[PDB]
Design a protein around this ligand. Sequence first.
Ligand code: CLA
Ligand code: CLA
Ligand code: CLA
Ligand code: CLA
Ligand code: CLA
Ligand code: CLA
Ligand SMILES: CC1=C(/C=C/C(C)=C/C=C/C(C)=C/C=C/C=C(C)/C=C/C=C(C)/C=C/C2=C(C)CCCC2(C)C)C(C)(C)CCC1
Ligand SMILES: CC1=C(/C=C/C(C)=C/C=C/C(C)=C/C=C/C=C(C)/C=C/C=C(C)/C=C/C2=C(C)CCCC2(C)C)C(C)(C)CCC1
Ligand SMILES: CC1=C(/C=C/C(C)=C/C=C/C(C)=C/C=C/C=C(C)/C=C/C=C(C)/C=C/C2=C(C)CCCC2(C)C)C(C)(C)CCC1
Ligand SMILES: CCCCCCCS[C@@H]1O[C@H](CO)[C@@H](O)[C@H](O)[C@H]1O
Ligand SMILES: CCCCCCCS[C@@H]1O[C@H](CO)[C@@H](O)[C@H](O)[C@H]1O
Ligand code: OEX
Ligand SMILES: [Ca+2]
Ligand SMILES: [Cl-]
Ligand SMILES: [Cl-]
Ligand SMILES: [Fe+2]
Lengths: 341, 30, 137, 334, 81, 451, 34
Amino acid sequence: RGWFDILDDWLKRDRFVFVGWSGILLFPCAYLALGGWLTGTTFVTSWYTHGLASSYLEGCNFLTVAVSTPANSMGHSLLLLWGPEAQGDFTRWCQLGGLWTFIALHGAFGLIGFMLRQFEIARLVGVRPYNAIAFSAPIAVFVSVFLIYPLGQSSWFFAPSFGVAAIFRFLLFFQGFHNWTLNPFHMMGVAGVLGGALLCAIHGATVENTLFQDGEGASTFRAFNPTQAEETYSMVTANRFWSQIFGIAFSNKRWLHFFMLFVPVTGLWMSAIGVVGLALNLRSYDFISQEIRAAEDPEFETFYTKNLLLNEGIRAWMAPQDQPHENFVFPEEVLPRGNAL
Amino acid sequence: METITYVFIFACIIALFFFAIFFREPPRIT
Amino acid sequence: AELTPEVLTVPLNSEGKTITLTEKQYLEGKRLFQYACASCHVGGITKTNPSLDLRTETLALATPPRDNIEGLVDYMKNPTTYDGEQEIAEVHPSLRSADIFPKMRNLTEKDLVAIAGHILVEPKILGDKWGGGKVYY
Amino acid sequence: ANLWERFCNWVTSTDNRLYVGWFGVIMIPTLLAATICFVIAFIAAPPVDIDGIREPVSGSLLYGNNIITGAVVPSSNAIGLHFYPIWEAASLDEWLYNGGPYQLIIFHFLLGASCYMGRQWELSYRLGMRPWICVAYSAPLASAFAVFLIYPIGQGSFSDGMPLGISGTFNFMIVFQAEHNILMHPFHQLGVAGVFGGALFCAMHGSLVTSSLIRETTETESANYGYKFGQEEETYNIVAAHGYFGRLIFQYASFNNSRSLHFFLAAWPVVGVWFAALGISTMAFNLNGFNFNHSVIDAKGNVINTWADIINRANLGMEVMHERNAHNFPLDLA
Amino acid sequence: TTGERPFSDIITSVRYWVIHSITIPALFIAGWLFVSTGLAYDVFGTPRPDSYYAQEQRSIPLVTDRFEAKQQVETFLEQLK
Amino acid sequence: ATNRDQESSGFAWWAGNARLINLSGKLLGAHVAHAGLIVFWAGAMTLFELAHFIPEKPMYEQGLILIPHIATLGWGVGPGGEVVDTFPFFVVGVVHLISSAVLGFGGVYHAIRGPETLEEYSSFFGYDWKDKNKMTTILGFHLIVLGIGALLLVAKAMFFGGLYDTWAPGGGDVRVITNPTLDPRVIFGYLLKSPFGGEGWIVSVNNLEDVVGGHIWIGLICIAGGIWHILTTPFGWARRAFIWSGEAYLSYSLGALSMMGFIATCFVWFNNTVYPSEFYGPTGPEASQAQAMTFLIRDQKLGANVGSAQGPTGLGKYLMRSPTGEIIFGGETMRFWDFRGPWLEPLRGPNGLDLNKIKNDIQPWQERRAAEYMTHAPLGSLNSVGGVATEINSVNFVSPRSWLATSHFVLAFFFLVGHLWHAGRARAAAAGFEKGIDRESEPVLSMPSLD
Amino acid sequence: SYPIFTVRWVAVHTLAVPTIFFLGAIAAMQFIQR
Ligand code: CLA
Ligand code: CLA
Ligand code: CLA
Ligand code: CLA
Ligand code: CLA
Ligand code: CLA
Ligand SMILES: CC1=C(/C=C/C(C)=C/C=C/C(C)=C/C=C/C=C(C)/C=C/C=C(C)/C=C/C2=C(C)CCCC2(C)C)C(C)(C)CCC1
Ligand SMILES: CC1=C(/C=C/C(C)=C/C=C/C(C)=C/C=C/C=C(C)/C=C/C=C(C)/C=C/C2=C(C)CCCC2(C)C)C(C)(C)CCC1
Ligand SMILES: CC1=C(/C=C/C(C)=C/C=C/C(C)=C/C=C/C=C(C)/C=C/C=C(C)/C=C/C2=C(C)CCCC2(C)C)C(C)(C)CCC1
Ligand SMILES: CCCCCCCS[C@@H]1O[C@H](CO)[C@@H](O)[C@H](O)[C@H]1O
Ligand SMILES: CCCCCCCS[C@@H]1O[C@H](CO)[C@@H](O)[C@H](O)[C@H]1O
Ligand code: OEX
Ligand SMILES: [Ca+2]
Ligand SMILES: [Cl-]
Ligand SMILES: [Cl-]
Ligand SMILES: [Fe+2]
């Protein structure tokens, strides 16, 4: 019972906010990621890196504020406050985008801390660590999209900027440049997100609608006791209901709840894999058979050819302002447009 | 060949629905 | 950059005289242009006839010339086609047609001047955006 | 019993492998017709003049599509909101050219899926259940009504209904973005919070119940064997789960009442999805996303772009390119 | 049940409000003045409304050199004159 | 405090108003106080609109929804819908606002001071939800009240100055309706029209004679119906079809209000007769047609022959045929060819838009109106930036038609939800399993296996 | 008797203190004119 074990004791006290050994990584990293976001969105510009206003101080609202990525000329610089770009100058570091790598990197360490916290608590309380296991999906998304994607591109400039409108810009960029809707890894992501939202709704509604009458109240929440042995709702009646409505039904509650982990977790992990390909511009952009046919046959048209026309408009119309380091000048006469518009 | 393949996979999935519903392992209270 | 007296100095007439509008006239001109004109002329274009815009170079080549306060004020009283040939008050808002364009009923001479000065100052601020349309948004 | 009585008893029987019921008597034939027509059209339909400009778009597998590119293509902009049943066409060939299968399909489908919802109420009543599963299903149902019926009504044409196909769905989304700035609309934002949060809570609930399953099996067998269909005793320890999750965050942020938890699991996705449906159904009448285009201006009057202006440029790309031969006049008013 | 004082005890006590009817308004005012004095602009390097562009310039002051980026920003700032 | 906690009522605070189901006195107070709230809003919102109102801008440029309703009744307006006297608006606002004090007084009195139940107090005002005859009598009183309301509209139109008539010969104006349509073939013919394009069910009503005649019918139907329900008790087949409880009746009304909400949405979206475009702005179809009309006039003035001008697709750039052959504007507004409006109709012949009329008869007032409507199309952002979604800030505009359609869709939608919620709950409560399944009598457990 | 300065107390003020400072800054910004 030396200092290590005494520290262990204190870290693990049962308090309002549990700490743990994981807390030593988690709390500072999460606090700084969140504080850096609130600080930048409130006070910091993106004039020098993007040519955008991005803070309440400049007149943006909650939808348009962001902490934006550094200039493309920074490449993948760590952009450390004491590094060769900012050279210890906190003001210049803000102006160069240092808050972006600040938030992304403390955010990444903070997510590691959070998952260690899920393991540490599961271990103390004596439960299996499936919550931590499930959290690997948020981690695969954060790491693929905020780190691997820009690392395969020219610079952090092309990572998502931390902001509501900014993230919307990132969605529309992926459509126009990567045709990311066409990508079967994104499509599996969608199915596991929408599938998970479906499972969340249908299971909550099923339990609430197959409840046992366990009190006299017409408001039925009080007729449950945490320590009760008995199921609060009828699996047998639920099972019959869905067997007869939909054709199949769950009959095994352990399977049901495992599947609820599996589906959205698996979806997120699939979308992450697609984004790793996009880091390299390795897209599902085209169906070659479609293009060969359409090039030779000017009457052949599908919704697939239509969406590429939209993509070509997005790229030509947005690139000069979205990618200012390229100094694009596209004369009016080259801009792709249909009739009238 | 491609159309045949797509329709073939679809028809298998429809057959699978039929067996999964009418020839499921029956749920048993036990 | 600031909205300086110089940015606010625009041609009064075709004979080289200028007038320097005050900051309050500039604001009144924005407000009144929004109130009476922007439904068709947002951003310096014209929605019901995109071939004609409110760019200064375009206004200069209009007949009579419209690139000065007097030409614009007169336009708002007695608008013509671009070559001066037809009077179009019956289809374009003006004081002469305040009866059929009721928004023009409250506009005073001072208001017309403020709208004129808006039309001339805005491209000095906005450059090609003014009269550019969506390409320059 | 007489014939009618016996028929009623069979229709409403709790013993049919699939429940029929009165909603089911309308649901069954309408869903069969919608299914059969969709399957045949998806495989074999000829190109359809969706935008009424005599520029037919190929949706079917045999006319050069794969599963991702294929669709049943919306009916012609020349038709608009006119009802175009097979018997209004001079021939099947005309009916096909003008996108008649789309209307047959979406009308039988929306009717059948509304009856599916009624049928969920109906069976829950026959089984002595509480009745509101059907209210959960009203969320995806309302979303299907938004994209196949309300949006076409607002815009004046079923040619602006969502196509029945994977790529056509993305087409509908991109054009919707151009025309309504849906991403900047708070009802679509609530939708995203509803489905991202539904997924998050789905995984969370899954993982917490799974984490606290009571040992009933050995390591060489699936823990699923630890639960038997119909057993009376709960199969996990809620108290350990709450003990876990209340410490992960803090005690009062965790649910200790399973009925409360399950109600939250129902309500969060359903309400968000009702807002998504309502976003589509109100952008149908062109009340659109927030517009901060040129909202930030410097002391001189120079525009200082924000991310809203960058969005705007992407949207312009979509707008100017979509249906590239259909517009003759400068404004896209529907 | 973890030892700390219940929040609802704390926030309905007179002493809590004696302390906080000072510290809360004090913090708020200090945040206010951080902006109203202009200090926020200086700490973070955010342009004031008259400081995005020189009077005649219409090009954005984009950083284009990674290792001299500090000097480029300093040079862009000097040109506001 | 009778029944004002969960223990005694069985209802949590968030379902608190369900504590009122069998307390007819407090529930009368809830209802009357609420009617107060509606009347208060009508009155206050009107005064607010009037205070903000500039009579020489169109109403639809001013965020107005209530002044347009008063003006359609023919109050305060003259030719073209020009505002000639704002005093009728002020009167409507003040009188509602004053009336709401009274309703609010009665509501507060019944809710907190008066007898909690009315049954001991009075056999005429007391009621048991399950007393079918008493329910049909109260329903009957309300039907008579409503038919009198409908006849108030008829009285306005025929005897007290008329209604605003956008279709009036020589230009929109207030007009007295002297020949209301009584012919049931016309009146009920609307009810059997298809709701699809070119037909539009009741929403197609396009002249005030039909509107006034319909309300004559409806007023008489409602008074006859009300007398009927006071004089009868529900028949056997109705008894066996419905659930008879307060919650069931609420559900039926939620269903009905939901339906009415969706209809009102379509009425304000498409109809320009009882929602005059002078007051509400152009309909979506109207403004799109007005754009085609604008450029047809423009390019024809420049020398284009607009009948023979072939557009890029092969269809006429300005003019083409509908699927039944009628000449209609071309481009995307082909979808809107069922549109009808007073500024366009002078150009229509038996075969649709007439090329002779187009070339020779288009008047400056038609050019102006088409230009006005094209540039006030009902498109705009949630923060009221007028125009397409990529338009720049400058014009502060969202059409009253979009405000009224979207709000009513949202309301109709949530009312359908409340219908399902309450109808399913009323069924379960009546059959006795709204609180869950009896563990010792679980119905599924006495049913045979499905397999 | 309860302590005053606890881990919970620190956690609470690490958030509450900057939040109030920031809300005052953002309130002041609403009066800034170009
Ligand atoms: C667990 C808490 C934690 C963690 C994991 C991090 C992690 C990080 N910080 Mg954050 N930070 C924290 C808490 C934390 N910080 C706190 C509490 C503050 C307030 C003071 C900050 C304020 C802060 C700022 C202002 C910045 C960072 C930055 C960084 C990044 C680079 C750090 C680095 O290079 O260290 C290098 C040092 C180590 C890894 C420690 C090594 C320890 C070894 C094992 C012992 C050897 C030391 C030896 C005895 C010394 C001899 C030296 C001699 C030769 C002269 C990285 C993401 C930078 C960044 O985000 O830029 C974009 C940055 O600018 N942090
Ligand atoms: C005439 C219409 C009407 C009437 C008289 C009732 C009456 C009743 N309802 Mg039903 N209901 C309706 C329409 C109606 N409802 C609609 C349209 C819906 C769909 C949402 C519902 C859904 C519903 C549910 C789900 C439940 C009821 C319940 C009840 C009972 C208790 C209500 C209570 O105490 O609420 C208390 C009120 C609140 C807690 C406030 C709710 C606030 C809403 C959600 C937000 C309003 C947003 C506002 C418009 C805009 C923002 C406001 C601003 C401050 C920011 C009572 C019989 C309960 C029941 O079944 O008892 C038998 C119950 O569980 N109702
Ligand atoms: C239109 C909205 C509305 C209306 C009209 C009512 C009406 C009523 N409610 Mg419901 N309620 C509502 C919304 C409403 N509620 C919402 C949104 C919720 C969720 C928060 C509830 C939750 C709720 C519960 C949990 C309960 C009620 C109960 C009641 C009844 C008894 C109230 C009482 O005892 O007050 C006591 C309160 C006071 C004495 C304070 C003053 C109240 C008055 C009315 C304020 C008047 C102010 C007004 C400006 C005065 C103008 C006067 C002027 C005209 C001269 C009353 C009929 C109770 C019940 O059913 O009893 C049987 C009950 O237990 N309600
Ligand atoms: C039918 C209802 C209705 C409609 C169509 C309108 C329409 C309009 N109003 Mg009016 N108004 C209403 C009701 C309505 N109002 C109510 C209830 C009030 C009292 C608060 C007012 C008080 C009012 C004022 C003081 C003003 C207006 C103004 C306006 C105009 C601008 C609106 C705006 O900018 O919105 C902005 C949009 C919002 C604030 C968004 C509302 C979103 C809600 C919260 C969503 C609702 C969801 C649902 C109901 C909740 C269910 C939850 C679920 C769990 C069940 C527009 C013509 C303005 C004007 O131009 O006057 C000339 C103006 O100054 N209104
Ligand atoms: C639908 C609304 C309604 C209903 C059904 C009732 C019903 C009742 N009221 Mg309440 N009340 C209301 C609204 C209502 N009241 C309003 C608006 C107020 C404020 C003025 C009151 C203030 C009030 C008080 C202060 C008292 C009652 C009492 C009573 C009871 C005796 C009434 C009686 O004998 O009159 C018999 C008939 C008459 C006196 C003549 C009626 C003449 C009316 C006004 C003609 C109106 C014509 C037309 C239909 C009105 C349209 C209104 C519409 C435009 C909004 C009875 C339970 C008493 C009570 O409960 O005893 C304990 C009692 O003391 N009421
Ligand atoms: C608010 C208005 C209202 C309400 C709630 C009621 C409620 C009631 N009525 Mg009364 N009634 C009313 C107004 C009303 N009535 C009026 C104005 C009249 C005069 C015309 C009547 C004349 C009347 C008679 C003659 C009878 C009733 C009966 C009844 C009872 C059974 C109703 C029923 O089964 O409907 C459901 C409707 C049907 C079963 C008809 C077939 C259903 C088809 C498929 C509906 C088609 C419409 C569809 C939804 C589309 C809408 C548009 C359409 C017009 C094309 C019930 C107590 C009965 C009774 O018991 O009297 C004591 C009865 O015989 N009522
Ligand atoms: C970065 C950095 C740092 C840090 C910092 C920090 C840590 C900060 C924090 C900060 C903070 C911590 C802040 C905060 C703020 C807050 C706010 C600003 C809030 C607001 C809110 C609101 C506004 C609300 C709203 C709402 C909602 C949300 C919902 C409900 C309803 C309502 C609407 C009410 C250091 C120094 C280390 C270093 C360098 C860099
Ligand atoms: C029951 C209850 C409730 C409710 C309540 C209510 C709903 C009430 C209502 C109430 C009301 C509803 C009230 C009203 C009032 C009103 C008044 C008080 C009025 C007055 C008026 C005046 C005074 C006028 C004035 C004027 C003139 C005459 C001219 C012009 C100008 C002016 C505007 C100045 C609650 C929820 C709370 C809960 C508890 C229970
Ligand atoms: C004013 C006006 C008019 C007229 C109107 C009228 C004449 C109306 C009528 C109306 C009516 C005459 C309506 C009716 C309705 C009905 C309904 C809405 C029904 C419902 C039903 C139900 C809901 C049922 C249910 C059920 C079934 C189906 C089965 C068994 C069970 C139960 C019973 C549950 C016009 C357009 C000319 C013009 C404008 C103005
Ligand atoms: C940050 C912890 C990782 C280093 C752990 C090495 C422990 S080192 C250890 O410390 C004990 C007290 O804990 C002493 O009793 C003992 O003499 C010493 O060897
Ligand atoms: C319920 C209160 C209704 C008040 C009735 C006001 C009458 S309304 C009045 O009637 C005149 C003919 O008598 C019309 O000429 C005039 O235009 C109209 O305003
Ligand atoms: O169709 Mn399908 O998309 Ca509704 O916007 Mn107009 O139309 Mn056409 O353009 Mn954009
Ligand atoms: Ca200034
Ligand atoms: Cl397209
Ligand atoms: Cl067009
Ligand atoms: Fe569960």
